[PDB]
């Protein structure tokens, strides 16, 4: 995030980090329950990648994080790689996340929910702060 | 080089009609734009959440998808519109 700010540790409990086997963070994701994570289909997640929950500082070795294995990758059948439309993938975890003060789920909206232009929302992540 | 600590940013949602002034026909119905306000999602944020507070609870409205190749803060980022994808999410969870 460019021009964002540091978050209060653990204040976005559903935010997970998707890392490859080398420990490299390549995408974010959100826990929707103990066994499922929602992410972008274009992230190209495989069962070799790891979901890291409860993390704030990726440079810290003292955080009680949860490294969860992925059982199956469910890419939305309507995903169009050419236009990047319907960019969503569900990841079913091999081992359920353990909810705590720093690990919990985000709510999902109803298909008819209305979120008006002008409404101020929030986005989070460990993406580039400067390009 | 991604930051060590988790970042956050508040930003406004745009209508797809106004977002089209920036992105043209690349904006589809299953997309929702936000930003062009001095902040921007960027490489590495992909897959992450865009949440809005509804009735006191944070709700997943978008999934970071794509945007400016230079993460310009005066251009809106594009997110996967969750309301258009939630029925698939629920069918998937119910059958697995």
């Amino acid at each position: 995030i460019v021009n964002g700010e540091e978050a209060v540790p653990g204040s976005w409990p559903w935010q997970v980090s998707l890392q490859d086997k080398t420990g490299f963070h390549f995408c974010g994701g959100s826990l929707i329950n103990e066994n499922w994570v929602v992410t972008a289909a274009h992230c190209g997640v495989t069962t070799s990648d790891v979901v890291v929950a409860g993390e704030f500082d990726q440079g810290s070795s003292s955080e009680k994080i949860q490294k969860l294995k992925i059982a199956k990758v469910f890419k939305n059948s309507k995903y169009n790689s050419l236009t990047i439309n319907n960019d969503i993938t569900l990841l079913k975890l091999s081992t359920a996340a353990s909810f705590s003060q720093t690990v919990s789920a985000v709510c999902l909206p109803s298909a008819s929910d209305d979120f008006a232009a002008g409404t101020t929302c929030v986005t989070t992540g460990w993406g580039l702060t400067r390009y | 080089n991604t930051p060590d600590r988790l970042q956050q940013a508040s930003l406004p949602l745009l209508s797809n009609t106004n977002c089209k002034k920036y992105w043209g026909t690349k904006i589809k119905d299953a997309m929702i734009c936000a930003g062009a306000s001095g902040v921007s999602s960027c490489m590495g944020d992909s897959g992450g959440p865009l949440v809005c507070k509804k009735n006191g609870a944070w709700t997943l409205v978008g999934i970071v998808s794509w945007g400016s190749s230079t993460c310009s803060t005066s251009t809106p980022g594009v997110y996967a519109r969750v309301t258009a994808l939630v029925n698939w999410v629920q069918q998937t969870l119910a059958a697995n």
Binding site: V8, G10, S11, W12, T102, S104, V122 | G56, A57
Partner: peptide
């Protein structure tokens, strides 16, 4: 869902 135990400060 959607109610963090540790409140975010924006």
């Amino acid at each position: 869902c959607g109610v963090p135990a540790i409140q975010p400060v924006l």
